[PDB]
Symmetry: D2
Subunit: 308 residues, 4 copies
């Protein structure tokens, strides 16, 4: 109703979260370890295309697990709910097992689930074509704003990803992939997708596409089917913030997805999309400043799912 006044509040919330200096920058690969703990950016894109940024909103960082709801949305857009969910579950798991009782990954937001979803997209073509296809989808979601790639993060993630190779071999053992899948090639594609780079600005447009029923707000183009968006938002709401998912659902009540680079892709349905980014993570793997910002945003603007 008054965007200028809303941005003053966003700036005040950004300043309050800026003081939260806690957390640890992820350091399992050098490409993550090098990031300054003081980098902090918040970008907003409303469903009507109004924009606002504060802080470090043009510094590229990897999507990491923030890409999981995006590739899940692409798979449902192309294949439908029924086909996708023959391979992956629909609910959160309690706070280590690679598969649920039905030999399926628990949901698309955990590594095993995202690895399986990766195997469903553009089957039958080489990895260069699969990657180009997802890149063109991400460009449409961001209204052609910054979508890049970190080869150094890709190389390091693959070289050091023993846990993801253990998951790949266990999924292969339990026949989790579509028949004729080259599992090692799927792991390559998975590491590549995690290594896609965005800024707070471009990622806020991707979150706004999810908030706007699948239509990119800065172009007006239909990018994702209503079904893909609805499924993605439901799973971001219950499975998107690692083992903090349940507490985030109760106190924040918004669909969101965190990543190890410090990003939090946030959706306020029919209102706006946001990307909050600060490299230091708490014990759950979520950006300390971003979590603080999310709690403050809902308390101030009453954006919670069940707020009257």
């Amino acid at each position: 109703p008054d965007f200028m006044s809303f941005t003053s509040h966003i700036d005040e919330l950004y300043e309050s979260a800026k003081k939260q200096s806690g957390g640890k920058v992820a350091d399992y690969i050098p490409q993550l370890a090098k990031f300054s703990p003081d980098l902090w950016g918040v970008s907003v894109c409303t469903v009507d295309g109004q924009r606002h940024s504060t802080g470090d909103t043009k510094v590229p960082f990897c999507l990491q697990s923030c890409v999981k709801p995006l590739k899940y949305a692409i798979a449902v857009n192309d294949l439908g709910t029924e086909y996708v969910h023959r391979y992956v579950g629909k609910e959160p798991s309690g706070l280590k097992l690679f598969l649920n009782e039905d030999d399926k990954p628990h949901n698309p937001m955990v590594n095993a689930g995202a690895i399986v979803v990766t195997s469903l997209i553009k089957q039958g073509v080489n990895n260069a074509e699969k990657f180009d296809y997802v890149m063109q989808f991400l460009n449409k979601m961001a209204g052609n704003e910054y979508v890049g790639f970190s080869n150094a993060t890709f190389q390091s993630e693959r070289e050091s990803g023993d846990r993801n190779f253990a998951i790949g071999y266990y999924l292969k053992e339990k026949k989790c992939f579509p028949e004729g899948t080259d599992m090692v090639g799927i792991l390559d594609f998975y590491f590549q997708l995690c290594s896609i780079e965005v800024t707070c600005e471009s990622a806020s447009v991707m979150a706004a596409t999810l908030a706007n029923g699948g239509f990119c707000p800065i172009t007006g183009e239909r990018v994702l089917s209503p079904e893909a968006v609805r499924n993605t938002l439901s799973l971001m709401h219950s499975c998107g913030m690692y083992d903090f998912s349940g507490q985030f659902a109760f106190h924040v009540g918004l669909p969101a997805k965190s990543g190890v680079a410090g990003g939090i892709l946030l959706v306020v349905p029919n209102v706006m999309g946001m990307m909050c980014w600060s490299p230091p993570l708490d014990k759950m793997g979520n950006s300390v400043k971003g979590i603080h910002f999310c709690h403050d945003l809902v308390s101030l603007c009453n954006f919670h799912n069940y707020d009257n």
Copy 2:
């Protein structure tokens, strides 16, 4: 926008669900076993007080676990989020343990959590006064419509409730109750609350109070604080349908709570409250006709939480 046309659709959905003859009427106590499998009623109360009923909507039945979100709402209304959640958790558990890692019941929608919530209400007074206090709250939620009591169900539940006595003694062992709690007396109060009787009509008004931000739509009276309603709706959405909670959240996306008598208390935020009732339950403990009706309602009217 057009209530008369909406009731025609409700009637059509009722007729389609009426054909779903599957399921088994609960038979662990004779008071449940005696119910006809053919009883089926649907009642609606909009946030503006518009009413509609079809089927067996004036036959009393016990709330059973449908009372859990109601007594949780009373506890938060009187004590606040912080105090209540020092004793009970805020998230769903995976598909048997009485307590989570912090020695707290997982959430207010499981037996252990509801037993703990029962111990927080009107502390310091006798059971007759505690029960009268909850009854007056339930009368306000229902706009003074049918709120009764089944002494036979209370007597049978207590006599045969070995699992709930095992939970009571384990909670006592782990110091789960407020100091000075008489655990056996809390179990009596718990069994009494489960044995409160409603009809589809009166229970639909209680669900409409939750849909209307805590204000009873047929009286205009404020019954529950905004915080109590918001917390209750969040926990009904993620924990309300037993081990079907996760699948209900994904496909239906509405706050709901089932009970072993075949009731499903359903909330469509800012639109209406409903009570669906049919004694035969599926393997998850949820009313077969009610589950079928809930899926059909969301597919027809687009009431899902993340529907654009």
Copy 3:
């Protein structure tokens, strides 16, 4: 071969273990909390009736969980392997669940298993007669040496035993007891059996009866059937030392059973029985001096099950 020389070694091992001052005396009831941490006794009874004691070997203490293999032996002696094991399992559990996948307690050495075994002995008579019957069996096992009773420990265990009442109600729920069992009465009998008092001297004769194929070495009387003794020794070997059972089996390799009063009932098959007692327990619930003594005994005399 040379008992006089063997007792010199027992005395040396006693002196070395005497220096191990670590551990904490159990303090959940005052009757355990009052024991001096410096009390330390070791008694030996060979299969030929040769006796040796060092330290505090005539100070009475409660058997506590040391009674579990004894009442299990009585149940198998009277009912046979097949009947007893229709109610209780035969193997160790990993390091909290009251029942295994078949709704049976894991084994007779855990509380749930011992509560079920208690329900199988002398069915059909009052508790006074059941207790007198077990007392006469324990007197025969000890060659009529010290077998007493601590009413104060019985009263305190029952008053504070919420976890055991939670187990009793869960076993009742899952139909774990023989039909017509009065569960509360079984819990009374269980608490009474745990409160039976022995000295190191009399308990060493009970352990020697188990080492001598069921024949009391100081009387020559057959007390337990060969089958009862064989089953009891197998379960003491794999399930007798709480969560230390697996490490005790590997490094010590002898059938043994610990209790919260600091007792360790030890059997060296066809050689001797022993009772080691020192109230301070380690984090696993086992007597610190007794564990140290057991490891030293096997390293010195080569008593391990698989020692050549």
Copy 4:
């Protein structure tokens, strides 16, 4: 005392077990699937070198998991208890997790534990030299009797062993191997060791070496240290028969190790070693005829660990 009469009983037990036609021959690789379900052999080697065979005792088959206690014995012989158990646990697990709470495989008898033990033997040399070293040890254990190799089983196990590659990558992730370990090379060596072929006759000599305190009974040569043998027998007793380990310990009470080719390596301490072989396996993965034979042997000869 009378070997001629004992062999008459062995023949009678062989004939009774021959009638047990149940079970399913393992068919996950063609090299196992091709074996006749009617092949059944029993070989005995006493600690004094007396021999007896009945049935198909010269038909080669793969050791498979029967090799696990043998390579564990080699590792303890060369490195000692302390060093080996810094990498692997000492106890049975309940009836799927790759590691225990300390990030160690549960014991040397499960795949993860055997893979870790494989990484400890002859570190620093190529796989050809590691394999030759283990082969020379196995030749000494068997008194230079049949020790062969199945290249077809090795090739198939490696090609189809996705679960073992998932375990290898998870162990690498959790730093389970000695520093500088080439995990893929360890998996090659592991598959090779499982593919070593024996007959009932030669394997009975290996079991007799374990029964004779590490001395080969047909040569008199010391092959394994007393410590290696004692540790191996303890772990075969509690962890050797898959999820049947606990029931085998209680009813049979002998150290034994089964394999998917239908072999059961059995040790009767200070008496004899045996190899029972019949390809059809029960639901636990144990040879049906061999399990039946083991139960009958203990009931007839009173060979149980705790038999008086």
